[PDB]
Amino acid sequence: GSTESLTVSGQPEHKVEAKDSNGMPVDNRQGTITVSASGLQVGDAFTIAGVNSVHQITKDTTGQPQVFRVLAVSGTTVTISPKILPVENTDVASRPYANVDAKPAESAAITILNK
């Protein structure tokens, strides 16, 4: 019997990096958020409002909410993954292999699962 106002402040966003400090190709990951929601710990899976997955059926955009896992939490700072990559943005070359349509404003509302 609790409220369903699960929101998050801050803007999680990472872009497809060409190379890192070693100068090798990078598949960027993670996304750290300061949550207004729940009080999460490591091991949750949830969907965020505005984050819609892509290429479920070979570059098919279906608008299905992307599910995230928790890797690390430091207070109300949750490091989540899979990362968020906009197929409608990012870059002409790097967007086709992105995982979601867009990276929404701030962090937005969350639908928490313990499954």
Coordinates of N, CA and C in Angstrom, one line a residue:
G1 N 0.8 -1.2 0.0 CA 0.0 0.0 0.0 C 0.8 1.3 0.0
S2 N 1.6 1.5 -1.1 CA 2.4 2.7 -1.2 C 2.1 3.4 -2.5
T3 N 2.6 4.7 -2.6 CA 2.4 5.5 -3.8 C 3.1 4.9 -5.0
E4 N 2.7 5.3 -6.2 CA 3.3 4.9 -7.4 C 4.1 6.0 -8.1
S5 N 4.5 7.0 -7.3 CA 5.2 8.1 -7.8 C 6.7 7.8 -7.8
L6 N 7.2 7.1 -8.8 CA 8.6 6.7 -8.9 C 9.3 7.5 -10.0
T7 N 10.0 8.5 -9.6 CA 10.7 9.4 -10.6 C 12.1 9.5 -10.3
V8 N 12.9 10.1 -11.2 CA 14.3 10.2 -11.1 C 14.8 11.5 -11.6
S9 N 15.7 12.1 -10.9 CA 16.3 13.4 -11.3 C 17.7 13.1 -11.9
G10 N 18.2 14.1 -12.7 CA 19.5 13.9 -13.4 C 19.3 13.3 -14.7
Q11 N 20.3 13.4 -15.6 CA 20.1 13.0 -17.0 C 21.1 11.9 -17.3
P12 N 20.7 10.6 -17.3 CA 21.5 9.5 -17.8 C 21.6 9.5 -19.3
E13 N 22.8 9.6 -19.8 CA 23.1 9.6 -21.2 C 24.5 9.3 -21.5
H14 N 24.7 8.4 -22.4 CA 26.1 8.1 -22.9 C 26.0 7.8 -24.4
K15 N 27.0 8.2 -25.1 CA 27.0 8.1 -26.5 C 28.0 7.0 -27.0
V16 N 27.8 6.5 -28.2 CA 28.7 5.5 -28.7 C 30.0 6.1 -28.9
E17 N 31.0 5.6 -28.1 CA 32.3 6.1 -28.2 C 33.2 5.4 -29.2
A18 N 33.9 6.1 -30.0 CA 34.8 5.6 -31.0 C 35.9 4.8 -30.4
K19 N 36.6 5.5 -29.5 CA 37.7 4.9 -28.8 C 37.8 5.4 -27.4
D20 N 38.4 4.6 -26.5 CA 38.5 5.0 -25.1 C 40.0 5.6 -24.8
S21 N 40.4 5.5 -23.6 CA 41.7 6.1 -23.2 C 42.8 5.3 -23.8
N22 N 42.6 4.0 -24.1 CA 43.6 3.1 -24.7 C 43.5 3.3 -26.3
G23 N 42.4 3.9 -26.7 CA 42.3 4.2 -28.1 C 41.7 3.0 -28.9
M24 N 40.9 2.2 -28.2 CA 40.3 1.0 -28.8 C 38.8 1.2 -28.9
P25 N 38.1 0.6 -29.8 CA 36.6 0.7 -30.0 C 35.9 0.4 -28.7
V26 N 34.9 1.2 -28.4 CA 34.2 1.1 -27.2 C 32.7 0.9 -27.4
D27 N 32.1 -0.1 -26.6 CA 30.7 -0.2 -26.5 C 30.3 0.3 -25.2
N28 N 29.8 1.6 -25.2 CA 29.5 2.3 -23.9 C 28.5 1.6 -23.1
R29 N 28.5 1.8 -21.8 CA 27.5 1.1 -21.0 C 27.1 2.0 -19.8
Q30 N 26.2 1.5 -19.0 CA 25.8 2.1 -17.7 C 25.1 3.4 -17.8
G31 N 24.7 4.0 -16.7 CA 24.0 5.2 -16.6 C 23.5 5.5 -15.2
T32 N 24.2 6.5 -14.6 CA 24.0 6.8 -13.2 C 22.9 7.8 -12.9
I33 N 21.9 7.4 -12.1 CA 20.7 8.3 -11.9 C 20.6 8.5 -10.4
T34 N 20.1 9.7 -10.0 CA 19.8 10.1 -8.6 C 18.2 9.9 -8.5
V35 N 17.8 8.9 -7.8 CA 16.4 8.5 -7.9 C 15.5 9.2 -6.9
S36 N 14.3 9.6 -7.3 CA 13.3 10.1 -6.5 C 12.3 8.9 -6.1
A37 N 12.8 7.7 -6.5 CA 11.9 6.6 -6.4 C 12.4 5.4 -5.6
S38 N 11.5 4.7 -5.0 CA 11.7 3.4 -4.3 C 12.8 3.4 -3.2
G39 N 14.1 3.6 -3.6 CA 15.2 3.4 -2.7 C 15.9 2.1 -3.2
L40 N 16.2 2.1 -4.4 CA 16.7 0.8 -5.1 C 18.0 0.3 -4.5
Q41 N 18.3 -1.0 -4.8 CA 19.6 -1.6 -4.6 C 20.0 -2.4 -5.8
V42 N 21.1 -3.1 -5.7 CA 21.6 -3.8 -6.9 C 20.7 -5.1 -7.1
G43 N 20.2 -5.3 -8.3 CA 19.5 -6.5 -8.6 C 18.1 -6.3 -9.1
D44 N 17.7 -5.0 -9.3 CA 16.3 -4.8 -9.8 C 16.3 -4.7 -11.3
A45 N 15.0 -4.8 -11.9 CA 14.8 -4.7 -13.3 C 13.6 -3.8 -13.5
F46 N 13.7 -2.8 -14.3 CA 12.5 -1.8 -14.4 C 12.5 -1.2 -15.8
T47 N 11.3 -0.6 -16.1 CA 11.2 0.1 -17.3 C 10.9 1.6 -17.1
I48 N 11.5 2.4 -17.9 CA 11.4 3.9 -17.7 C 10.5 4.5 -18.7
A49 N 9.7 5.5 -18.3 CA 8.8 6.2 -19.2 C 9.5 7.0 -20.3
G50 N 9.3 6.7 -21.5 CA 9.9 7.4 -22.6 C 11.0 6.5 -23.3
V51 N 11.5 5.6 -22.6 CA 12.5 4.7 -23.1 C 11.9 3.5 -23.8
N52 N 11.8 3.6 -25.1 CA 11.2 2.5 -25.9 C 12.3 1.7 -26.7
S53 N 12.3 0.4 -26.6 CA 13.3 -0.4 -27.3 C 13.1 -0.5 -28.7
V54 N 14.1 -0.9 -29.5 CA 14.1 -1.0 -30.9 C 14.6 -2.3 -31.3
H55 N 14.7 -2.5 -32.7 CA 15.2 -3.7 -33.3 C 15.0 -5.0 -32.5
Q56 N 13.7 -5.2 -32.1 CA 13.4 -6.4 -31.5 C 13.2 -7.5 -32.6
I57 N 12.6 -7.0 -33.7 CA 12.5 -7.9 -34.9 C 13.2 -7.3 -36.1
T58 N 14.5 -7.4 -36.1 CA 15.4 -6.9 -37.1 C 15.1 -5.4 -37.4
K59 N 15.7 -4.6 -36.6 CA 15.5 -3.1 -36.8 C 14.1 -2.7 -36.7
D60 N 13.2 -3.5 -36.1 CA 11.8 -3.2 -35.9 C 11.6 -2.3 -34.7
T61 N 10.9 -1.2 -34.8 CA 10.6 -0.3 -33.7 C 9.2 -0.5 -33.2
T62 N 9.1 -1.0 -32.0 CA 7.8 -1.5 -31.5 C 7.3 -0.7 -30.3
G63 N 8.1 0.2 -29.8 CA 7.7 1.1 -28.7 C 7.6 0.3 -27.4
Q64 N 8.2 -0.9 -27.3 CA 8.1 -1.6 -26.0 C 9.1 -1.1 -25.0
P65 N 8.7 -0.8 -23.8 CA 9.5 -0.3 -22.7 C 10.8 -1.1 -22.5
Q66 N 11.9 -0.5 -22.4 CA 13.2 -1.1 -22.2 C 13.4 -1.5 -20.8
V67 N 13.8 -2.7 -20.5 CA 14.0 -3.2 -19.1 C 15.5 -3.0 -18.7
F68 N 15.7 -2.5 -17.5 CA 17.1 -2.2 -17.1 C 17.4 -3.1 -15.9
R69 N 18.7 -3.4 -15.7 CA 19.2 -4.0 -14.6 C 20.0 -3.1 -13.7
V70 N 20.2 -3.4 -12.5 CA 21.0 -2.5 -11.6 C 22.3 -3.2 -11.3
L71 N 23.4 -2.4 -11.5 CA 24.7 -3.0 -11.3 C 25.3 -2.5 -10.0
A72 N 25.0 -1.2 -9.6 CA 25.6 -0.7 -8.4 C 24.7 0.5 -7.9
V73 N 24.5 0.6 -6.6 CA 23.8 1.7 -6.0 C 24.6 2.3 -4.9
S74 N 24.7 3.6 -4.9 CA 25.4 4.3 -3.9 C 24.5 5.4 -3.3
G75 N 23.8 5.0 -2.3 CA 22.7 5.9 -1.7 C 21.5 5.9 -2.7
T76 N 21.1 7.1 -3.1 CA 20.1 7.2 -4.1 C 20.7 7.4 -5.5
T77 N 21.9 6.9 -5.7 CA 22.6 7.0 -7.0 C 22.7 5.6 -7.6
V78 N 21.8 5.3 -8.6 CA 21.7 4.0 -9.2 C 22.4 3.9 -10.5
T79 N 23.4 3.0 -10.6 CA 24.1 2.7 -11.9 C 23.4 1.6 -12.7
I80 N 22.7 2.0 -13.7 CA 21.9 1.0 -14.4 C 22.5 0.6 -15.8
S81 N 22.0 -0.5 -16.3 CA 22.4 -1.0 -17.6 C 21.4 -2.1 -17.9
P82 N 21.2 -2.5 -19.2 CA 21.8 -1.9 -20.4 C 21.6 -0.4 -20.5
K83 N 22.6 0.1 -21.2 CA 22.7 1.6 -21.4 C 21.6 2.1 -22.4
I84 N 21.4 3.4 -22.5 CA 20.4 4.0 -23.3 C 21.0 4.6 -24.5
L85 N 20.7 4.1 -25.7 CA 21.2 4.7 -27.0 C 20.1 5.0 -27.9
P86 N 19.9 6.2 -28.3 CA 18.9 6.7 -29.2 C 19.1 6.3 -30.7
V87 N 18.1 5.6 -31.3 CA 18.2 5.2 -32.7 C 17.7 6.4 -33.6
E88 N 17.0 7.3 -33.0 CA 16.5 8.5 -33.7 C 17.5 9.6 -33.6
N89 N 18.5 9.5 -32.8 CA 19.5 10.5 -32.6 C 20.9 9.9 -32.7
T90 N 21.8 10.2 -31.7 CA 23.2 9.7 -31.6 C 24.0 10.2 -32.8
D91 N 23.8 9.5 -33.9 CA 24.6 9.8 -35.2 C 24.0 8.9 -36.3
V92 N 24.1 9.3 -37.5 CA 23.6 8.6 -38.6 C 24.2 7.2 -38.7
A93 N 25.5 7.1 -38.3 CA 26.2 5.8 -38.3 C 25.9 5.0 -37.0
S94 N 25.9 5.7 -35.9 CA 25.8 5.0 -34.6 C 24.4 4.7 -34.1
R95 N 23.4 5.4 -34.7 CA 22.0 5.2 -34.3 C 21.4 3.8 -34.7
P96 N 21.8 3.3 -35.9 CA 21.2 2.0 -36.3 C 21.4 0.8 -35.4
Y97 N 22.5 0.9 -34.6 CA 22.8 -0.1 -33.7 C 22.6 0.4 -32.2
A98 N 21.7 1.3 -32.1 CA 21.3 1.7 -30.8 C 20.1 0.9 -30.3
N99 N 19.9 0.9 -29.0 CA 18.9 0.0 -28.3 C 17.5 0.6 -28.1
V100 N 17.4 1.9 -28.1 CA 16.1 2.6 -27.9 C 15.9 3.7 -28.8
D101 N 14.7 4.2 -29.0 CA 14.3 5.3 -29.9 C 15.0 6.6 -29.5
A102 N 15.0 6.8 -28.2 CA 15.6 8.1 -27.7 C 16.0 8.0 -26.3
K103 N 16.8 9.0 -25.8 CA 17.1 9.1 -24.4 C 16.3 10.3 -23.9
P104 N 15.2 10.0 -23.0 CA 14.3 11.0 -22.6 C 14.9 12.1 -21.8
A105 N 14.1 13.2 -21.6 CA 14.5 14.3 -20.7 C 14.6 13.8 -19.3
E106 N 15.6 14.3 -18.6 CA 16.0 13.8 -17.2 C 16.0 12.3 -17.2
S107 N 15.5 11.7 -16.1 CA 15.4 10.3 -16.0 C 14.0 9.8 -16.2
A108 N 13.1 10.6 -15.7 CA 11.6 10.3 -15.9 C 11.1 9.3 -14.9
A109 N 9.9 8.8 -15.1 CA 9.2 7.9 -14.2 C 9.6 6.5 -14.4
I110 N 9.6 5.6 -13.4 CA 10.0 4.3 -13.5 C 9.0 3.3 -13.1
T111 N 8.9 2.1 -13.7 CA 8.1 1.0 -13.3 C 8.9 -0.1 -12.8
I112 N 9.0 -0.2 -11.5 CA 10.0 -1.1 -10.8 C 9.4 -2.5 -10.7
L113 N 10.3 -3.5 -11.1 CA 10.0 -4.9 -10.9 C 11.1 -5.5 -10.1
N114 N 10.7 -6.6 -9.4 CA 11.6 -7.3 -8.6 C 11.8 -8.7 -9.2
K115 N 11.3 -8.9 -10.4 CA 11.4 -10.1 -11.1 C 12.6 -10.1 -12.1

